[PDB]
RNA sequence: AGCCAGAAACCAUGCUGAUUAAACAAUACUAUCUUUUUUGUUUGCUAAUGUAAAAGAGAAAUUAUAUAUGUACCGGUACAUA
RNA sequence: CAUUUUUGGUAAGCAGAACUGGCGAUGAGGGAUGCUCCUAACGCUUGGAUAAGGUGCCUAAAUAUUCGCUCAUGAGAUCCCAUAAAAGGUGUUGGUUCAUAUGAACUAGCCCUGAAAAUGGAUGGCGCUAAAGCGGAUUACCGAUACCAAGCCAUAAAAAGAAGAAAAAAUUUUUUUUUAGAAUCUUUUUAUGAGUAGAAAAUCGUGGGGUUUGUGUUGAAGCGAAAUACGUGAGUUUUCGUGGA
RNA sequence: UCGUUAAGAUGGAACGGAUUAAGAGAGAAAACAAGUAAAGAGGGGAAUAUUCUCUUCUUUAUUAAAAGAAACAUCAGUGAUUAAUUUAAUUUCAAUAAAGCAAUCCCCUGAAAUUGUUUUCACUUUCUCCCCGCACUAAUGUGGGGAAAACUGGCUUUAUUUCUUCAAUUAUUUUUUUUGCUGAGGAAUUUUAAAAUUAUUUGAAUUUUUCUUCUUAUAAUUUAAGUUGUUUCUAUACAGUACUUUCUUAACCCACUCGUCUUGAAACACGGACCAAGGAGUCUAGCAAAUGUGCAAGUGUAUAUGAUUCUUUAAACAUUUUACGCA
């Protein structure tokens, strides 16, 4: 059920996958809100796939936080180090999809100079 | 002089005159209790909502106990109120300072016996949201008056035992 | 020293205070605002002359006699070392079933009360500490196997505090043993383990 | 379940904050909000609210009308939460002290020529933060031509709203129900 | 309350089926193999693991119920015992 | 559609009205089952105690207590609700009037007769008779997202606001962490949270354009498979594999 | 869509929700270990191209520590339990052992002669005794008829209450035994102030006090002023079979074809074999209100002219004082 880690409480692990998605193969699993009449979702019959709800929303101290205890910041250029040094105690680097290996390695070295771990550090090696 | 009236019944399917009297009475929630100044118009209003309320004479221990354990008060500006547990006299000594009450015992005294300053104190306090009775009822939809076992309407003194049961 | 509101007389111990939090903006503070932690104030069943069952230790089921209540609220207990080979052990009152039965059954045993009391008086919590240097010394052996477990037991044995505790334990056992030993039935009861079987009611059972 | 009128909510209406992206006016309302919250007086609060209001609630105030009011207040400072317009029905000025949201250049020049005083709201704020000995003014609300079409249905008894007429033409919208001779009359 | 005889009806009997019982019994012969003990079971494969219920998994008169069981006499009588 | 008043029509789950409440537009708990009956209206969670309703088993709680009545060769068993009457009864139980511990007469309680249909068949089923039947009463226990307390989320309203040293580690001085002032903003408080048709706002994505400052063959986009990933969510972000602009 | 291999499942559906499980995978980025010493690889800054000096990664081992999960204790909030308790109140007793009083009698309870009375006689026990019926009975007795007494009960007393009692039901109160659940917050001046409590100090009070009250002065503390402490363990790990987490079946409880028009669809109402791509409130005209913007008794610059305007320029810029639209 509910997932405490320190004073970071996250309410719901399980994603609100879309109503009867396996039943009709054409349906995709990402949420879509029925405008149907007698849909067994909005007409709120118990035991079906649950609706997402704002109530499940994160606590304001946590909001977007990771179990890392640092907010993730995605990095595609070396120059992004300069704000990240001042924020290192509150923010963590993630290196972007594209980043060429020579540049990526250089950013990884820079991140170590900034004393902040890369959360996807082993990538492209 | 006073009568304590406890609501018993849900807000589904309410008659329209009964909705109006409930609105004036302030028993909006199903386990609301409130103090009422004995009068004839108040009694007649009480008679109209009777099958949805029990009521009676509360006794000093109960009055003291209820205000102490379940006393909340309306803190904010006129119709910009907020529900605060009392916990200190200085707050309520502010609003009821003009009418010279200034203290929770004085509030207990007026609630227990209707005196010069009852309406304001009564209004100023938040309506008592009670628990369920911790040993239930014989049958909710039947009168205390009935030969058949029941609970609604005048419970007189014995209202106190019910209040103690549902505190 | 104590607070007496509603007649209670609590008994106050200075709180150690250890946990720091980063505070509202600037820097950090210790979490504990209070300065005095309440003394434990154990239930009246727990008492020195009583023999008690150790519920779930290594030596569990043994009938062991209380010695000293420590300031931690943890008390010391021994299923005599002469009788059973069992250490003078630290225990909570939550893990020890104290009986009504009294070690001082006879006048001879009661005449050796002061010596037992002096022996009881000397012990303290610091003798029961693991010791980080020693704990590491045992750990550092990891990186045939059964032998190393024996060596860990030897390392435990070597400690001065363990030896000091064992001395007092031996002195208490030596002091009490002959009078205890002379009554064979009581000795057998002392040796005998607590047991649960059919017709162990628990709820009506007297201890 | 608690029975609640309007679901317990205060759902009062009107402007939340200035919808314009205009920097000077956003800056100006920040100032007057600051003054309004700190200051004891109503005056600042009323000015702040009036500054926030829509365009149709920003009417122009006539210079003649301001002049007509201020002659009973002869040394005092008028503030106007709208624009001040000039008057070509007006022979001359009697010398005035005016703070306004906007000045037409001809009016401003006339005020300067008269030896009067043109105050911006920031300058007024500096000089008179209390609003003591100042005079709040505002222009006509119901002067506007849309409102001249508002009110009781055209052709319905006692009505006097202007119709949204088809065109200017002579033959149109004077017959049925608008003269007794043809059908009836309002 | 207690009973009796009494119908082309009823249930057996009879007769048919019975991989309708994921049913079963007896007999006949056979497959380096069976039996006892020790250690192991942290290229599709080629050492090898599973339990719905250990914790003292302790306990075999009997018709009974407006009375039973022995023992002694001739299903009955007498005498003990729960 | 329902209660109550109600008109037509033999009647009708029929047609037509009145007042009010529901459903429609509504989940949830009970009614064996059931759009509407009863209880009761709903953010996300933890705990409590109750309601309607139950407590022989299915099926959670009593083979509870307590007084009656009840045996049926088709008994009976929770509103709506799925049949049932006039009329009988020397079955049994109480009454009440008469007569002389009996003979009459009545009376209403239960039970019986009155009481026949269509796949096999329905107190929900099994069953139940010292009830688990019918009529009471006495408690305890069980029983909801309703009720109370607590946390968190958003919405609504209200407060309030346009500058300074805290801790730990060392050996007073060195070392380690922190040190907020961005108005659709930050801190705080209380209240609120149903929903078709419908209205609004906040978002997220796609094609192109200007602008800004980046990503590219030390393999990007794309695609498949994923990720202790982030978001209430649409989504976003990322890894490995393929891939080659 | 179909094939291969492997893993799982399989008693008339199939999938799902909620919650755990066992398997199968994945992971170290918070999910342990700063600094110190040794020798490798790099990089910088200063002094007047190289001396001085500062730095980060690999490597050997070497002391910290912190962090979470447990566990108990301690508080404060909120429950559940099982013992109680105070002084009142309300036609409430019961014994204790000595006295008395009356026998169908009395505490009682019957039955009788607007408005009050009051008076009459009816009523107990017996394991006591007698007579008839003699064993006649449900009976270790008995049907009928009579007596006897005061043991029994009842009243009046006098003492007595832990011998046995001192109920019960209200009223105001005061506690207590186990125990369940909870811990938001984070106090640069509301974690402040007072209260409380303890040790002091001064004056009073009164039910008169080893938790008696107030206020006079001083300190500490917490019941004030939203959890803290201690000890384990993970672990002396570097990813493991543990731990995180995905997938996977299970199992308990719940779970009717979606869209759709219709008051009403799980329907014996209609559409839908399946998958991919494409696929439906737009544009112009005129008008209106809204809100922004510029100006104001004016406004727009129309057609068009003009220019040191000429890839982008098909726009941009300009307009030598009673033109026209609308006001």
Coordinates of N, CA and C in Angstrom, one line a residue, chain D residues 10-130:
Chain D
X10 N -18.0 30.8 0.5 CA -18.1 32.1 0.1 C -17.7 32.2 -1.4
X11 N -18.6 32.5 -2.3 CA -18.3 32.6 -3.7 C -18.6 33.9 -4.3
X12 N -18.3 35.0 -3.6 CA -18.2 36.4 -4.1 C -17.5 36.6 -5.4
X13 N -17.7 37.7 -6.0 CA -17.4 37.9 -7.4 C -16.4 39.1 -7.7
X14 N -16.3 39.4 -9.0 CA -15.4 40.6 -9.4 C -14.0 40.3 -9.5
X15 N -13.2 41.3 -10.0 CA -11.8 41.1 -10.4 C -10.9 40.6 -9.3
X16 N -10.1 39.5 -9.6 CA -9.1 38.9 -8.7 C -7.8 39.8 -8.7
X17 N -7.3 40.2 -9.8 CA -6.1 41.0 -10.0 C -6.2 41.6 -11.3
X18 N -5.3 42.5 -11.6 CA -5.2 43.2 -12.9 C -4.9 42.2 -14.1
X19 N -5.8 42.1 -15.1 CA -5.6 41.2 -16.2 C -4.6 41.7 -17.2
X20 N -4.4 43.0 -17.3 CA -3.5 43.6 -18.2 C -2.0 43.2 -17.9
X21 N -1.2 43.1 -19.0 CA 0.2 42.8 -18.9 C 1.0 44.1 -18.9
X22 N 0.4 45.3 -18.9 CA 1.0 46.6 -18.9 C 1.9 46.8 -17.6
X23 N 3.2 46.9 -17.7 CA 4.1 47.0 -16.6 C 3.9 48.1 -15.6
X24 N 3.6 49.3 -16.2 CA 3.4 50.5 -15.3 C 2.2 50.4 -14.5
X25 N 1.1 49.9 -15.0 CA -0.1 49.7 -14.3 C 0.0 48.6 -13.3
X26 N 0.7 47.5 -13.6 CA 0.9 46.4 -12.6 C 1.8 46.9 -11.5
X27 N 2.8 47.7 -11.7 CA 3.6 48.3 -10.8 C 2.8 49.3 -9.9
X28 N 1.9 50.1 -10.5 CA 1.1 51.0 -9.8 C 0.1 50.4 -8.8
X29 N -0.5 49.3 -9.2 CA -1.4 48.6 -8.4 C -0.7 47.9 -7.2
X30 N 0.5 47.3 -7.4 CA 1.3 46.8 -6.3 C 1.5 47.9 -5.3
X31 N 1.9 49.1 -5.7 CA 2.0 50.3 -4.8 C 0.7 50.5 -4.0
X32 N -0.4 50.7 -4.7 CA -1.6 51.1 -4.1 C -2.2 49.9 -3.2
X33 N -2.0 48.7 -3.6 CA -2.3 47.5 -2.7 C -1.5 47.6 -1.4
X34 N -0.2 47.9 -1.5 CA 0.7 48.0 -0.3 C 0.2 49.1 0.6
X35 N -0.2 50.3 0.1 CA -0.7 51.4 0.8 C -2.0 51.0 1.5
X36 N -2.9 50.4 0.7 CA -4.2 50.0 1.1 C -4.2 49.0 2.3
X37 N -3.4 48.0 2.2 CA -3.3 47.0 3.3 C -2.7 47.6 4.6
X38 N -1.6 48.4 4.5 CA -1.0 49.0 5.7 C -1.8 50.1 6.3
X39 N -2.2 51.1 5.5 CA -2.9 52.3 6.0 C -4.3 52.0 6.6
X40 N -4.7 52.7 7.7 CA -6.0 52.5 8.3 C -7.2 52.9 7.5
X41 N -7.1 54.0 6.7 CA -8.1 54.6 5.9 C -8.8 53.8 4.8
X42 N -10.0 54.0 4.5 CA -10.7 53.4 3.4 C -10.2 53.9 2.1
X43 N -9.7 55.1 2.0 CA -9.4 55.9 0.8 C -8.5 55.2 -0.2
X44 N -7.4 54.7 0.3 CA -6.4 53.9 -0.4 C -6.9 52.6 -1.0
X45 N -7.7 51.9 -0.2 CA -8.3 50.6 -0.6 C -9.3 50.8 -1.7
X46 N -10.2 51.8 -1.6 CA -11.1 52.2 -2.7 C -10.4 52.6 -4.0
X47 N -9.3 53.4 -3.9 CA -8.4 53.7 -5.0 C -7.8 52.5 -5.7
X48 N -7.3 51.6 -4.9 CA -6.7 50.3 -5.3 C -7.7 49.5 -6.1
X49 N -8.9 49.3 -5.6 CA -10.0 48.5 -6.2 C -10.3 49.2 -7.5
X50 N -10.5 50.5 -7.5 CA -10.9 51.3 -8.7 C -9.9 51.3 -9.8
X51 N -8.6 51.3 -9.4 CA -7.5 51.1 -10.3 C -7.6 49.7 -11.0
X52 N -7.9 48.6 -10.3 CA -8.1 47.3 -10.9 C -9.1 47.2 -12.0
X53 N -10.3 47.9 -11.8 CA -11.5 47.7 -12.6 C -11.4 47.7 -14.2
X54 N -12.3 47.1 -14.9 CA -12.5 47.1 -16.3 C -12.5 48.5 -17.0
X55 N -12.3 48.5 -18.3 CA -12.3 49.7 -19.2 C -13.6 50.5 -19.1
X56 N -14.8 49.8 -19.1 CA -16.1 50.5 -19.0 C -16.3 51.0 -17.6
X57 N -15.6 50.5 -16.6 CA -15.5 51.1 -15.3 C -14.3 52.0 -15.1
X58 N -13.6 52.2 -16.2 CA -12.6 53.3 -16.3 C -13.2 54.4 -17.2
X59 N -14.4 55.1 -17.0 CA -14.9 56.1 -17.8 C -14.0 57.4 -17.8
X60 N -14.1 58.3 -18.7 CA -13.5 59.6 -18.6 C -14.3 60.5 -17.7
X61 N -13.7 61.4 -16.9 CA -14.2 62.4 -16.1 C -14.1 63.8 -16.9
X62 N -15.1 64.6 -16.9 CA -15.0 65.8 -17.6 C -14.4 66.9 -16.7
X63 N -13.5 67.7 -17.3 CA -12.8 68.8 -16.7 C -13.8 69.8 -16.1
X64 N -14.8 70.1 -16.8 CA -15.9 71.0 -16.4 C -16.6 70.4 -15.1
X65 N -16.9 69.1 -15.1 CA -17.5 68.4 -14.0 C -16.6 68.4 -12.7
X66 N -15.3 68.2 -12.9 CA -14.3 68.3 -11.9 C -14.3 69.7 -11.3
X67 N -14.2 70.7 -12.2 CA -14.2 72.1 -11.9 C -15.5 72.5 -11.1
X68 N -16.6 72.0 -11.6 CA -17.9 72.3 -10.9 C -17.9 71.7 -9.5
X69 N -17.4 70.5 -9.3 CA -17.3 69.9 -7.9 C -16.3 70.6 -7.0
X70 N -15.1 71.0 -7.5 CA -14.0 71.5 -6.7 C -14.2 73.0 -6.3
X71 N -15.2 73.7 -6.7 CA -15.4 75.1 -6.4 C -15.9 75.2 -4.9
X72 N -16.4 74.1 -4.4 CA -16.8 74.1 -3.0 C -15.7 73.5 -2.1
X73 N -14.5 73.3 -2.7 CA -13.4 72.6 -2.1 C -12.1 73.3 -2.5
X74 N -11.9 74.5 -2.3 CA -11.3 75.5 -3.2 C -9.8 75.4 -3.2
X75 N -9.2 74.8 -2.2 CA -7.7 74.7 -2.1 C -7.3 73.3 -2.1
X76 N -8.2 72.3 -2.4 CA -8.0 70.9 -2.1 C -7.6 70.1 -3.4
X77 N -7.1 68.9 -3.2 CA -6.6 68.1 -4.3 C -7.6 67.0 -4.6
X78 N -8.1 67.1 -5.9 CA -8.9 66.1 -6.5 C -8.1 64.9 -7.0
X79 N -8.5 63.7 -6.7 CA -7.9 62.5 -7.3 C -9.0 61.8 -8.1
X80 N -8.7 61.4 -9.3 CA -9.6 60.8 -10.3 C -9.1 59.4 -10.7
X81 N -9.8 58.3 -10.4 CA -9.4 57.0 -10.9 C -9.7 56.7 -12.4
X82 N -9.8 57.7 -13.2 CA -10.0 57.6 -14.6 C -9.2 58.6 -15.4
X83 N -9.7 58.9 -16.7 CA -9.0 59.9 -17.5 C -9.7 61.2 -17.4
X84 N -9.0 62.3 -17.5 CA -9.7 63.6 -17.6 C -9.7 64.2 -19.0
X85 N -10.9 64.6 -19.5 CA -11.0 65.1 -20.9 C -11.3 66.5 -20.9
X86 N -11.0 67.2 -22.0 CA -11.1 68.6 -22.1 C -12.5 69.0 -22.6
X87 N -12.9 70.3 -22.6 CA -14.2 70.7 -22.9 C -14.2 71.9 -23.8
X88 N -14.8 71.8 -25.0 CA -14.9 72.8 -26.0 C -16.2 73.5 -25.9
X89 N -17.0 73.2 -24.9 CA -18.1 74.0 -24.4 C -17.7 74.8 -23.2
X90 N -16.5 74.7 -22.8 CA -16.0 75.4 -21.6 C -15.2 76.6 -22.0
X91 N -15.6 77.8 -21.5 CA -14.9 79.1 -21.8 C -13.5 79.2 -21.3
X92 N -13.3 78.9 -20.0 CA -12.0 79.1 -19.3 C -11.9 78.2 -18.1
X93 N -10.7 78.2 -17.4 CA -10.5 77.4 -16.2 C -10.4 78.4 -15.0
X94 N -10.6 77.8 -13.8 CA -10.6 78.5 -12.5 C -9.4 78.1 -11.6
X95 N -8.5 77.3 -12.2 CA -7.3 76.8 -11.6 C -7.5 75.7 -10.6
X96 N -6.9 74.5 -10.9 CA -7.3 73.2 -10.3 C -6.1 72.4 -9.9
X97 N -6.3 71.5 -8.9 CA -5.3 70.5 -8.5 C -5.8 69.2 -8.8
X98 N -5.3 68.5 -9.8 CA -5.9 67.2 -10.3 C -4.8 66.1 -10.4
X99 N -5.1 65.0 -9.8 CA -4.5 63.7 -10.0 C -5.4 62.8 -10.8
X100 N -5.0 62.3 -12.0 CA -5.8 61.4 -12.8 C -5.0 60.3 -13.4
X101 N -5.7 59.2 -13.8 CA -5.1 58.0 -14.4 C -4.5 58.4 -15.8
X102 N -5.1 59.2 -16.6 CA -4.7 59.7 -17.9 C -5.1 61.1 -18.1
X103 N -4.3 61.9 -18.7 CA -4.6 63.3 -19.1 C -4.6 63.4 -20.6
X104 N -5.7 63.9 -21.2 CA -5.5 64.4 -22.6 C -4.6 65.6 -22.6
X105 N -3.7 65.7 -23.7 CA -2.7 66.7 -23.7 C -3.2 68.1 -23.8
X106 N -4.3 68.3 -24.5 CA -5.0 69.6 -24.5 C -5.5 70.0 -23.1
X107 N -6.1 69.1 -22.3 CA -6.5 69.4 -21.0 C -5.4 69.7 -20.1
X108 N -4.3 68.9 -20.1 CA -3.1 69.1 -19.4 C -2.5 70.4 -19.6
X109 N -2.3 70.8 -20.9 CA -1.8 72.1 -21.3 C -2.7 73.2 -20.8
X110 N -4.0 73.1 -20.8 CA -5.0 74.0 -20.3 C -4.8 74.2 -18.8
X111 N -4.7 73.0 -18.0 CA -4.4 73.0 -16.6 C -3.1 73.7 -16.3
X112 N -2.0 73.5 -17.0 CA -0.7 74.1 -16.8 C -0.8 75.6 -17.1
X113 N -1.5 76.0 -18.2 CA -1.8 77.4 -18.6 C -2.6 78.1 -17.5
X114 N -3.6 77.5 -16.9 CA -4.4 78.0 -15.8 C -3.6 78.1 -14.5
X115 N -2.4 77.5 -14.4 CA -1.5 77.5 -13.2 C -1.9 76.4 -12.3
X116 N -2.7 75.5 -12.7 CA -3.1 74.3 -12.0 C -2.0 73.3 -11.9
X117 N -2.3 72.1 -11.4 CA -1.3 71.0 -11.0 C -1.8 69.7 -11.6
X118 N -0.9 69.0 -12.4 CA -1.1 67.7 -12.9 C -0.3 66.7 -12.1
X119 N -1.0 65.9 -11.4 CA -0.5 64.9 -10.5 C -0.6 63.5 -11.1
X120 N 0.4 62.7 -11.2 CA 0.3 61.2 -11.3 C 0.0 60.6 -10.0
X121 N -0.5 59.3 -10.0 CA -0.8 58.6 -8.8 C 0.4 58.3 -7.9
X122 N 1.6 58.0 -8.5 CA 2.8 57.9 -7.7 C 3.2 59.2 -7.0
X123 N 3.1 60.3 -7.7 CA 3.3 61.6 -7.1 C 2.3 61.9 -6.0
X124 N 1.0 61.6 -6.2 CA 0.0 61.7 -5.2 C 0.3 60.8 -4.0
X125 N 0.7 59.6 -4.2 CA 1.1 58.6 -3.2 C 2.2 59.2 -2.3
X126 N 3.3 59.8 -2.9 CA 4.3 60.4 -2.2 C 3.9 61.6 -1.3
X127 N 3.1 62.5 -1.9 CA 2.7 63.7 -1.3 C 1.6 63.5 -0.2
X128 N 0.6 62.6 -0.5 CA -0.5 62.4 0.3 C -0.8 60.9 0.5
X129 N 0.1 60.2 1.3 CA -0.1 58.7 1.5 C -1.4 58.4 2.3
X130 N -1.7 59.3 3.2 CA -2.9 59.2 4.1 C -4.2 59.4 3.3

